RNA sequence: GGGGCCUUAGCUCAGCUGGGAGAGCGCCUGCUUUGCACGCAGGAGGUCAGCGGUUCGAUCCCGCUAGGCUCCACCA
RNA sequence: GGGGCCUUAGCUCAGGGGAGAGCGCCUGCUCGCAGGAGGUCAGCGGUUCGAUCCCGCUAGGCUCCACCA
RNA sequence: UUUACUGCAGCCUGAUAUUGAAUUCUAACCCGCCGCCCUUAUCGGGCGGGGAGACAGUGUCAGGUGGGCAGUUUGACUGGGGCGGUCGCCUCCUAAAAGGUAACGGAGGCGCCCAAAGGUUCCCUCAGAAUGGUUGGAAAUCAUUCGCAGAGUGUAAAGGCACAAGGGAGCUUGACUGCGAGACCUACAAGUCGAGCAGGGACGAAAGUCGGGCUUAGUGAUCCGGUGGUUCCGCAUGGAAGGGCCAUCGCUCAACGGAUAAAAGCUACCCCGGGGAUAACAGGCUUAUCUCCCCCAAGAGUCCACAUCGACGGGGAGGUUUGGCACCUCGAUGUCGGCUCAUCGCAUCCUGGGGCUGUAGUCGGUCCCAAGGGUUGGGCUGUUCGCCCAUUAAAGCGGUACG
RNA sequence: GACGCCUGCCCGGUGCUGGAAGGUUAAGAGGAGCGCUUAGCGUAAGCGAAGGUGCGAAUUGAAGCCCCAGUAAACGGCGGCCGUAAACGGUCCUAAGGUAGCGAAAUUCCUUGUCGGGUAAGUUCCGACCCGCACGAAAGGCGCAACGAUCUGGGCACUGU
């Protein structure tokens, strides 16, 4: 129920972050905005 | 006219004898007339005739 | 065992 | 599971000895073919257990080994009954 | 030699930690039973292994004599 | 003596949120019914809000070993 | 040896070439089928007839089955080995007031969880006792005091925390990109803390804090592959296949520094190199057991603890039993029971001399002094031991590598 | 493994034999489709016909395996608790729980089981009880005349054992 997930940027497209989430508490796709090293700014990152 | 435990029907004959101290209750299967069981069990030696 | 059976 | 065990837990025959005697006398068929007291059953079979002058045909749904009526009357489903 | 348990009716055995001896089988008596050796009550049998101390009475407690089972270690 | 599995109604057996069958006993109803008596869940003690359910121990019942000089 | 692993013969089954023509036919192919010739010939070949026939056999490829046959594996710790148990990480004690420190020593947990229980800002203080309350009884919920923590701190032990790290709300994702002076532990590999700079933020007016949770466990190298990115290389050139770098995924590799992607057993048919580093026999050290000797005294013993036994406990001697340890021997210390020959110590079986007796005498009981001598013939069992028969004055215990 | 009388129950698993209704099926056929190059269209980055070169999806493709029956003089197995007087009843489990005949045995830990015989004394022997840890019917069961350089008991004769 606790799986490895990655977070790719919506603008850049690269998989910049990894984290973990519980599938039962969070069935939906998470949306955390993080710093993008390529874009030099904080962009929205989406789980892929 | 008792139904058997497997479902079919087989008539049973129950014999009640009231002879004082020689009284007994004996159940037979009414086709071969062998003793299924008796209330008082008797040996071939003790009461040699009519062994139950 | 220690059987003395030397030949 | 076994046939007599399934008849015991499905409450069709309340005693395992009676179910064993009935299945050993050649009365119960699974999927048309005759079978003994120990034929393994699957969910989705068509039992043809024969009582005294009855032709009860049921359908297997689940297989659980619980000796309680709360979890017993949910495995067999009656399809049709024939007196003779 | 060391500890333990018993000797109780013809036989197998209980009897509580001293308050006055019995069960079953076995042997007779009487009743009853239409009949298949299927039932009932009543009698004996014991110095409780033998002797003597205690107390109001001892299989029981105590001492002294005959007996039977257990219980004790190997080893390579 | 050492591992493994159980101790649940009178008997035989299933089974973290408050536990059940067949037989044995009843209850009214003319080959099957719908209900009741009986459970220290073998006992103790810790983790929490509660234990047949998780654990450290005592008695008990099965199974496998206790071999080499 | 096998349902250990990985394979080889053998057998079975498909495709393909021999191999043709429309179930059928025959020139391919096969006849340990028949007549003639080579030919003096049950080999072979040729010629005719007949049978089968594009089947079979053979070559190549493929899948099953296959200890029948091979090559191997089958862990370590261990108060000998086997068996049981354990193997990595975290907390306490042992640990001797720095750190560290072992044992098959004593107690427990972890192979997670939380999009919030994370970050910031702003507020508040817990558990239990009593009184009063209607369904509240010892406890559901509510007011009061006494409450420095007897509460809580996700999970479990220690350390710590109410100047709260403990509870309640608002806004958020710092649960961050490149790093990092300097340090702690110290075989290495690895692990841990870290002021501070830059880029982009979150909260807060600001100071400021934030590179996950009060801290310490919740995890494993390399190789080989998968995914995304890449002003990197890419075998004459241009590309591509592929490789490099960065990020990330695939382990009960749990024997957790992981031998290989892949592995169980028997040998009383056994062999070799070593060990008394390590067991069985006998010596050695201890005496938990074992055999004896005592202390106290309730009591039994008709009165009476001590004629004789002696509860509950207490103190010793001996190395004869069973043990513990593994000091000596594994380039050999022959191990039970009997036969033969004995010797030694009394904790004395008899015989000799005594004390006390609930010793009238005989026979006895207990305790002293005494090893001089003697301490049996059988039935059973390999037996020591033990039971029984018949004696005897008695048929004694032990040590001497259980002589 | 002479001979005499018999050889009971179980096909669940594994072997053997028979059967494809339905799945799993290799090589070989078969080729969809997707990458790499480029004659050329293109301001930029890309698109791209014919060939060549790799990956090859669907569809076919036997034995064998899953499955279904029989077969035990095939491999093999023939159980527990509680009552009631072997036998019957209640319950769990399996494929079913040992039939006949033997039984303290070349099989029995307890154990030198109990009783009797043999002897003055018999952990050995013989004959019965079943209380069979852990007999058992072709890895045969129970008896059996004759036979044995076999094993275990008991007698006569005989002797320096």
Curated annotation (Swiss-Prot), chain A:
The keyword Ribonucleoprotein applies. Pfam families: Ribosomal_L33. This is Large ribosomal subunit protein bL33A. Residues 20-48 are annotated as: Disordered. GO terms for cellular component: cytoplasm; ribonucleoprotein complex; ribosome. Part of the 50S ribosomal subunit. Interacts with VmlR. Coiled coil: none annotated. One of its GO terms (molecular function) is structural constituent of ribosome. One of its GO terms (biological process) is translation. The keyword Repeat does not apply. Gene3D superfamilies: Ribosomal protein L33 (2.20.28.120). Keywords: Ribonucleoprotein, Ribosomal protein.
From Swiss-Prot, chain B:
Induction: Up-regulated under secretion stress conditions, possibly in a CssR/CssS-dependent manner. Disruption phenotype: Not essential in rich media; synthetic growth defects are seen in double rqcH-ssrA mutants, further exacerbated by translational inhibitors spectinomycin and erythromycin or at elevated temperatures. Decreased accumulation of a stalled reporter protein. Double rqcH-rqcP deletion strains grow normally in rich media. Triple rqcH-clpP-ssrA mutants cannot be generated. No change in sensitivity to erythromycin; double mutSB-rqcH and triple mutSB-rqcH-ssrA deletion strains are hypersensitive to erythromycin. Loss of Ala tailing. Activity of this protein is best tested in a clpP or ssrA deletion mutant; ssrA (tmRNA) encodes the SsrA tag added to nascent proteins in stalled ribosomes by trans-translation, which targets the nascent protein for degradation. Key component of the ribosome quality control system (RQC), a ribosome-associated complex that mediates the extraction of incompletely synthesized nascent chains from stalled ribosomes and their subsequent degradation. RqcH recruits Ala-charged tRNA, and with RqcP directs the elongation of stalled nascent chains on 50S ribosomal subunits, leading to non-templated C-terminal alanine extensions (Ala tail). The Ala tail promotes nascent chain degradation. RqcH, RqcP and charged tRNA(Ala) are necessary and sufficient to add an Ala tail to a model stalled nascent peptide; does not add Val. Belongs to the NEMF family. This is Rqc2 homolog RqcH. It comes from Bacillus subtilis (strain 168). The chain holds residues 105 to 156 of 570 of the full protein.
Swiss-Prot record, chain D:
Transmembrane segments: none annotated. Keywords: Protein biosynthesis, RNA-binding, rRNA-binding, tRNA-binding. GO terms for molecular function: rRNA binding; tRNA binding. Gene3D superfamilies: RNA-binding S4 domain. InterPro entries: RqcP, S4_RNA-bd, S4_RNA-bd_sf. GO terms for cellular component: RQC complex. The keyword Protein biosynthesis applies. SUPFAM superfamilies: Alpha-L RNA-binding motif. Disruption phenotype: Not essential; synthetic growth defects can be seen in double rqcP-ssrA mutants. Double rqcH-rqcP deletion strains grow normally in rich media. Loss of Ala tailing, RqcH is still recruited to the 50S ribosomal subunit. In vivo mild decrease in tRNA(Ala)-binding by RqcH. CDD domains: S4. Residues 1-62 form the S4 RNA-binding domain. GO terms for biological process: rescue of stalled ribosome. Changing residue 2 to A: Synthetic growth defect with ssrA deletion, no longer associates with 50S ribosomal subunit. Associates with stalled 50S ribosomal subunits. Binds to RqcH, 23S rRNA and the P-site tRNA. Does not require RqcH for association with 50S subunits. Crystallized 50S subunits are variously associated with an A/P-site tRNA with or without RqcH, as well as with P- and E-site tRNAs but no RqcH. Displaced from the 50S subunit by puromycin but not thiostrepton. Belongs to the RqcP family. Key component of the ribosome quality control system (RQC), a ribosome-associated complex that mediates the extraction of incompletely synthesized nascent chains from stalled ribosomes and their subsequent degradation. RqcH recruits Ala-charged tRNA, and with RqcP directs the elongation of stalled nascent chains on 50S ribosomal subunits, leading to non-templated C-terminal alanine extensions (Ala tail). The Ala tail promotes nascent chain degradation. RqcP is associated with the translocation-like movement of the peptidyl-tRNA from the A-site into the P-site. This is RQC P-site tRNA stabilizing factor. It comes from Bacillus subtilis (strain 168). The lineage of its organism: Bacteria, Bacillati, Bacillota, Bacilli, Bacillales.
């Amino acid at each position: 129920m606790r799986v490895n997930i990655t977070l790719a940027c919506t603008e850049c497209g690269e998989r910049n972050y990894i984290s973990k989430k519980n599938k039962r508490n969070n069935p939906d796709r998470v949306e955390f905005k993080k710093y993008c090293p390529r874009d030099k700014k904080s962009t929205l990152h989406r789980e892929t | 006219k008792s139904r058997n435990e497997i479902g079919d029907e087989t008539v049973r004959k129950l014999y009640v004898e009231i002879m004082g101290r020689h009284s007994n209750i004996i159940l037979t299967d009414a086709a071969e007339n062998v003793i299924i069981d008796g209330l008082k069990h008797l040996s071939p030696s003790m009461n040699s005739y009519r062994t139950v | 065992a220690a059987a003395a059976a030397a030949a | 599971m076994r046939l007599d065990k399934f008849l015991k837990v499905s409450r069709l025959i309340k005693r395992r000895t009676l179910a064993k005697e009935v299945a050993d006398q050649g009365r119960i068929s699974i999927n048309g073919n005759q079978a003994k007291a120990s034929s393994d059953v699957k969910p989705g079979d068509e039992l043809t257990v024969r009582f005294g002058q009855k032709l009860v045909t049921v359908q297997v749904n689940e297989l659980k080994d619980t000796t309680k009526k709360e979890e017993a009357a949910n495995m067999y489903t009656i399809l049709k009954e024939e007196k003779l």
